[PDB]
Design an enzyme around this catalytic site. Structure first.
Site, PDB file in Angstrom:
ATOM      1  CG  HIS A 350       8.019   1.334  -3.215  1.00  0.00           C
ATOM      2  ND1 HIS A 350       8.040   1.106  -4.570  1.00  0.00           N
ATOM      3  CD2 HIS A 350       7.866   0.124  -2.632  1.00  0.00           C
ATOM      4  CE1 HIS A 350       7.903  -0.184  -4.800  1.00  0.00           C
ATOM      5  NE2 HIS A 350       7.817  -0.806  -3.639  1.00  0.00           N
ATOM      6  NE  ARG A 542      -3.871   9.392  -4.741  1.00  0.00           N
ATOM      7  CZ  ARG A 542      -4.213   8.456  -3.853  1.00  0.00           C
ATOM      8  NH1 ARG A 542      -4.326   7.166  -4.187  1.00  0.00           N
ATOM      9  NH2 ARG A 542      -4.484   8.827  -2.608  1.00  0.00           N
ATOM     10  CE  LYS A 547       3.108  11.627  -6.436  1.00  0.00           C
ATOM     11  NZ  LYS A 547       3.841  10.837  -7.467  1.00  0.00           N
ATOM     12  CB  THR A 649       6.109   4.098 -13.123  1.00  0.00           C
ATOM     13  OG1 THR A 649       4.898   4.299 -12.385  1.00  0.00           O
ATOM     14  CG2 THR A 649       7.122   3.377 -12.250  1.00  0.00           C
TER      15      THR A 649
HETATM   16  C1  LIG Z   1      -0.089   1.875   5.979  1.00  0.00           C
HETATM   17  C2  LIG Z   1      -1.074   2.747   5.176  1.00  0.00           C
HETATM   18  C3  LIG Z   1      -1.195   4.099   5.849  1.00  0.00           C
HETATM   19  C4  LIG Z   1      -0.657   2.981   3.828  1.00  0.00           C
HETATM   20  C5  LIG Z   1       0.681   3.235   3.495  1.00  0.00           C
HETATM   21  C6  LIG Z   1       1.057   3.455   2.158  1.00  0.00           C
HETATM   22  C7  LIG Z   1       0.068   3.486   1.152  1.00  0.00           C
HETATM   23  C8  LIG Z   1       0.322   3.703  -0.208  1.00  0.00           C
HETATM   24  C9  LIG Z   1       1.678   4.002  -0.753  1.00  0.00           C
HETATM   25  C10 LIG Z   1       1.854   4.239  -2.262  1.00  0.00           C
HETATM   26  O1  LIG Z   1       0.870   4.265  -3.016  1.00  0.00           O
HETATM   27  N1  LIG Z   1       3.140   4.503  -2.576  1.00  0.00           N
HETATM   28  C11 LIG Z   1       3.553   4.716  -3.874  1.00  0.00           C
HETATM   29  O2  LIG Z   1       2.804   4.640  -4.843  1.00  0.00           O
HETATM   30  N2  LIG Z   1       4.870   4.926  -4.034  1.00  0.00           N
HETATM   31  C12 LIG Z   1       5.500   5.124  -5.347  1.00  0.00           C
HETATM   32  O3  LIG Z   1       6.045   3.838  -5.737  1.00  0.00           O
HETATM   33  C13 LIG Z   1       6.400   3.872  -7.121  1.00  0.00           C
HETATM   34  C14 LIG Z   1       6.860   2.511  -7.624  1.00  0.00           C
HETATM   35  O4  LIG Z   1       8.132   2.251  -7.017  1.00  0.00           O
HETATM   36  C15 LIG Z   1       7.519   4.964  -7.367  1.00  0.00           C
HETATM   37  O5  LIG Z   1       7.764   5.080  -8.788  1.00  0.00           O
HETATM   38  C16 LIG Z   1       7.146   6.292  -6.758  1.00  0.00           C
HETATM   39  O6  LIG Z   1       8.313   7.135  -6.780  1.00  0.00           O
HETATM   40  C17 LIG Z   1       6.657   6.104  -5.288  1.00  0.00           C
HETATM   41  O7  LIG Z   1       6.205   7.352  -4.749  1.00  0.00           O
HETATM   42  C18 LIG Z   1      -1.263   3.251   1.494  1.00  0.00           C
HETATM   43  C19 LIG Z   1      -1.625   3.013   2.821  1.00  0.00           C
HETATM   44  C1  LIG Z   2       1.632   5.141 -13.772  1.00  0.00           C
HETATM   45  C2  LIG Z   2       0.498   5.546 -12.862  1.00  0.00           C
HETATM   46  C3  LIG Z   2       0.774   6.280 -11.605  1.00  0.00           C
HETATM   47  C4  LIG Z   2       2.198   6.628 -11.225  1.00  0.00           C
HETATM   48  O1  LIG Z   2       2.403   7.938 -11.686  1.00  0.00           O
HETATM   49  P1  LIG Z   2       3.684   8.785 -11.148  1.00  0.00           P
HETATM   50  O2  LIG Z   2       3.623   9.928 -12.128  1.00  0.00           O
HETATM   51  O3  LIG Z   2       4.900   7.962 -11.308  1.00  0.00           O
HETATM   52  O4  LIG Z   2       3.346   9.148  -9.751  1.00  0.00           O
HETATM   53  C5  LIG Z   2      -0.284   6.648 -10.774  1.00  0.00           C
HETATM   54  N1  LIG Z   2      -1.578   6.368 -11.098  1.00  0.00           N
HETATM   55  C6  LIG Z   2      -1.927   5.710 -12.235  1.00  0.00           C
HETATM   56  C7  LIG Z   2      -3.348   5.386 -12.575  1.00  0.00           C
HETATM   57  C8  LIG Z   2      -0.904   5.265 -13.169  1.00  0.00           C
HETATM   58  O5  LIG Z   2      -1.255   4.591 -14.303  1.00  0.00           O
END
Ligand SMILES: CC(C)c1ccc(/C=C/C(=O)NC(=O)N[C@@H]2O[C@H](CO)[C@@H](O)[C@H](O)[C@H]2O)cc1
Ligand SMILES: *Cc1c(COP(=O)(O)O)cnc(C)c1O
Ligand SMILES: O=c1[nH]cnc2c1ncn2[C@@H]1O[C@@H](COP(=O)(O)O)[C@@H](O)[C@H]1O
Length: 809
Positions: A350, A542, A547, A649
């Site tokens: 990801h 976020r 971003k 997404t």
């Molecule tokens: C080990 C500990 C420190 C830890 C590591 C990671 C996270 C959270 C990652 C996350 O929330 N990542 C995240 O949301 N990615 C997004 O994934 C989406 C689905 O594939 C993509 O659409 C986004 O581009 C990507 O940033 C939390 C705690």
């Molecule tokens: C869809 C969704 C996200 C992902 O948003 P991105 O614009 O792709 O980072 C994050 N938080 C919530 C609550 C969502 O519904």
């Protein structure tokens, strides 16, 4: 009221009413004279839950009988939001319940607002897992989500004096009617101890034990009577644990802390022991459940009956844990165990940002999981022996591909472990999957090209259209029927309505209604006034530097400055809404939130501006708030630096709900523009190729400051205390970052972004042509159904065929 919400048959309405009154009496132990809206919410929730249980019992019985291949989706996050309306939608009970509650003198919309979100994730990754569960149920796959039941999910965000405050999300306070505790299926998980080498193999001994108690939540498919399970593990002390007497009992908290709280730091990897325990906890309990199920039916056929999908590296310990069970407990030879492991496991990546990758200090693994460390070392030696045989003499490749990273502190690179141990590795949008093969995992792709795949992300059109925007769903259904809800590609039929005057009017009316409702929601809940005729310009996600919420801030200040310069000149009115949580220790993200509210404070009170520009920070952005704001949006801000957002997404959510997109060619924006046509998308800024050229040469922000007067004015206003009168140096860290060490090149895209925003405003002045472009986006959003995504996972990774056929009710 509306067709897509199902029938309100007189038997059904009568039956729902009596079961509602039964639950209020027997389950809640109340009568009408002292019942509150919360009690009514619970009576409805139990009433709807009853309709799931028959289908749930017989779905699981069906899987026992037919013994299909099982898909296990392992994730540390499942961002589910609310369950009541989604369940009603999927069972076709929404109009029935609306009628039933109306006849009891209640408003069902008001009862829906009482439900707490299940906020067990951070953002996109967590929400993807939730969309995936919905699609797997809808496509009839024997799928199980496995995770942790956090007592506290993602924190509730409060804004105090324009600063983020975090408070605990005590989401279980009033109970969770959807879950069923299964204390009878409790399993032990081991930690610490030491390894003994006997005559007959290794033994992991002297371990501390924590129990994993499962809680099961039903996952209904869309009108197919399939109900799958999400099983979330909760940590429990054993009864002999620590056994002053009183302190020994109180110390049970130490073991139970494993499932207490979700880690919210989604920007920067920090190796904390408690997170490692979480990651092992979920993997160790889950794999015992998997093996139990497999035996109730010779490990040669294990990959024929089991697939394990790793959501990021967070459950990567599944690889050495499966090896441990097979070698140490089942006594398989190493080579056979490895074959079985590789054919069972698949890994989804990801992010390409290197600070986000999990690299666990060897000293933590040595202490917490001494056997798993030994296994990881053995995997590494055998893997590097293969690398050496394929690329003889390439010694640098050997250090680059190693799972063990050398240096100040040795670390295990968990991404390298996943690639070695999986038959398939995928990115989440085409450009991201290409970046993995060309850059960060180039060496691995050259060794094993067949492993690398793309699976572009998607969203469920149940939650993200039918549930949150029924008005739009209905006007679509009127023209093309209801089959598009489980076959979103049918939205292409709407291209033949792009010149239909009635449909143009209806699409515009639905958006206006959604905007009026959201404008009413804002005033009521938060006491803030907005013009419903303005363009709703929204960036919700976020808060991260990549971003580039900061780039949006610079455009907002530009607009304000242009207005103050020529105040009697007409401009398209805007309401600019930005919302999102910052990770608690991410100082720059917290500063950005403060800057957004500080801009708002100036702009919203300037009498010369009037109602032509408003800047709103949307507090506590979460799934239930996304469901409200996304149907109200006109313009979707998707403006990350090219090559940084793996997919996105939220972008897809906006496309489906009738907003136009202003974006960079990053993540799934590329594919969205390809589907709709570049003429129907507001593309701007550097491409990935441009970013690389700028990096080779060296990014000098001063150049842009020297050359662009409008940008220079903004930076001088930030520096001099224009937006922080009493604290004139408040934003020095922001200015300093922008001028001297901006990894994400905010100034490089500024001119093109501002120009592009002018093209947005130009089109918004012609409502008919705006709406026509909207229809072309909605009509081509079909590819971004998570049903398409899951069918690809099923066919190309898991080796199973999806089915749309009903189970018998
Ligand atoms: C080990 C500990 C420190 C830890 C590591 C990671 C996270 C959270 C990652 C996350 O929330 N990542 C995240 O949301 N990615 C997004 O994934 C989406 C689905 O594939 C993509 O659409 C986004 O581009 C990507 O940033 C939390 C705690
Ligand atoms: C869809 C969704 C996200 C992902 O948003 P991105 O614009 O792709 O980072 C994050 N938080 C919530 C609550 C969502 O519904
Ligand atoms: O020994 C058995 N006899 C009959 N049904 C079983 C048995 N073991 C499992 N099942 C079925 O499959 C189970 C599904 O639960 P799981 O095994 O926890 O996924 C039960 O709900 C039963 O419907």
């Amino acid at each position: 009221q509306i067709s897509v919400r199902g029938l309100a048959g007189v038997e059904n309405v009568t039956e729902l009413k009596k079961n509602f009154n039964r639950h209020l009496h027997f389950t809640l132990v109340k009568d009408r004279n002292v019942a509150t809206p919360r009690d009514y919410y619970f009576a409805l929730a139990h009433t709807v839950r009853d309709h799931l249980v028959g289908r749930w019992i017989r779905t699981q019985q069906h899987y026992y009988e037919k013994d299909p291949k099982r898909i296990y989706y392992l994730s540390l996050e499942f961002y589910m939001g609310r369950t009541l309306q989604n369940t009603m939608v999927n069972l076709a009970l929404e109009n029935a319940c609306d009628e039933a509650t109306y006849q009891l003198g209640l408003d069902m919309e008001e009862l829906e607002e009482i439900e707490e979100d299940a906020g067990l994730g951070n953002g996109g990754l967590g929400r993807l897992a939730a969309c995936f569960l919905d699609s797997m149920a809808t496509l009839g796959l024997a799928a199980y989500g496995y995770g942790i039941r956090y007592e506290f999910g993602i924190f509730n965000q409060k804004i105090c004096g324009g600063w983020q405050m975090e408070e605990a999300d005590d989401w279980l306070r009033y109970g969770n009617p959807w879950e069923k505790a299964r204390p009878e299926f409790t399993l032990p998980v081991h930690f610490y101890g030491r390894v003994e080498h006997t005559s007959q193999g290794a033994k992991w001994v002297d371990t501390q034990v924590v129990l994993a108690m499962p809680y099961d939540t039903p996952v209904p498919g869309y009108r197919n009577n399939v109900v799958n399970t999400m099983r979330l593990w909760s940590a429990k002390a054993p009864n002999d644990f620590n056994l002053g007497y009183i302190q020994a009992v109180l110390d049970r908290n130490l073991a139970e802390n494993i499932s207490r709280v979700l880690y919210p730091n989604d920007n920067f990897f920090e190796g904390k022991e408690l997170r490692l325990k979480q990651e092992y906890f979920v993997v160790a309990a889950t794999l015992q459940d998997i093996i139990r199920r497999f035996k109730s039916s010779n490990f040669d056929a294990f990959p024929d009956k089991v697939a394990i999908q790793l959501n990021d590296t967070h459950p990567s310990l599944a690889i050495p844990e499966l090896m441990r069970v097979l070698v140490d407990l089942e006594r398989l030879d190493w080579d056979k165990a490895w074959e079985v492991t590789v054919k069972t496991c698949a890994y989804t990546n990801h992010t390409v940002l290197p600070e986000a990758l999990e690299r666990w200090p060897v000293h933590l693994l040595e202490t917490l999981l001494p056997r798993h460390l030994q296994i990881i070392y053995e995997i590494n030696q055998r893997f590097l022996n293969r690398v050496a045989a394929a690329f003889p003499g390439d010694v640098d490749r050997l250090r680059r591909m190693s799972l063990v990273e050398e240096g100040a502190v040795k670390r295990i690179n968990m991404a390298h472990l996943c690639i070695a141990g999986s038959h398939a590795v995928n990115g989440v949008a085409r450009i991201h999957s290409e970046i993995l093969k060309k850059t960060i995992f180039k060496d691995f792709y050259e060794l094993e090209p067949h492993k690398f795949q793309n699976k572009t992300n998607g969203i469920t059109p149940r939650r993200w259209l039918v549930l949150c925007n029924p008005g739009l769903a209905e006007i679509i259904a009127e023209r093309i029927g209801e089959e598009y809800i489980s076959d979103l590609d049918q939205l292409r039929k709407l291209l033949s309505y792009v010149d239909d005057e009635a449909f143009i009017r209806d699409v515009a009316k639905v958006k206006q209604e959604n905007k009026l409702k959201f404008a009413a929601y804002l005033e009521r809940e938060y006491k803030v006034h907005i013009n419903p005729n303005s363009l709703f310009d929204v960036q919700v996600k976020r808060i991260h530097e990549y971003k580039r919420q900061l780039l949006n801030c610079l455009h907002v200040i530009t607009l304000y400055n242009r207005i103050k310069k020529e105040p009697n000149k007409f401009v398209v009115p805007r309401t600019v809404m930005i919302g999102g949580k910052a990770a608690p220790g991410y100082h720059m993200a917290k500063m950005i939130i403060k800057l957004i509210t500080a801009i708002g404070d100036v702009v919203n009170h300037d009498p010369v501006v009037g109602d032509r520009l408003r800047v709103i920070f949307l507090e506590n952005y979460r799934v239930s708030l996304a469901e409200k704001v996304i149907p109200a949006a006109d313009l979707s801000e998707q403006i990350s630096t090219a090559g940084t957002e793996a997919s996105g997404t939220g972008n897809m959510k906006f496309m489906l709900n009738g907003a136009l997109t202003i974006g960079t060619m990053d993540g799934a924006n590329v594919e969205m523009a390809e589907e709709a046509g570049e003429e129907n998308f507001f593309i701007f800024g550097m491409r990935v190729e441009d970013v690389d050229r700028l990096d080779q040469r060296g990014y000098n922000a001063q150049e842009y400051y020297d050359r662009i007067p409008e940008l220079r004015q903004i930076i001088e206003q930030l520096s001099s205390g224009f937006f922080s009168p009493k604290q004139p140096d408040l934003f020095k860290d922001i200015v300093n970052m922008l001028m001297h060490h901006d990894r994400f090149k905010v100034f490089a895209d500024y001119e093109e972004y501002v120009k592009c925003q002018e093209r947005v405003s130009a089109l918004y002045k012609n409502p008919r042509e705006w709406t026509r472009m909207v229809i072309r986006n909605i009509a081509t959003s079909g590819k971004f159904s998570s049903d398409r995504t899951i069918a690809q996972y099923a066919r190309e990774i898991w080796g199973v065929e999806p089915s749309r056929q009903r189970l018998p009710a």
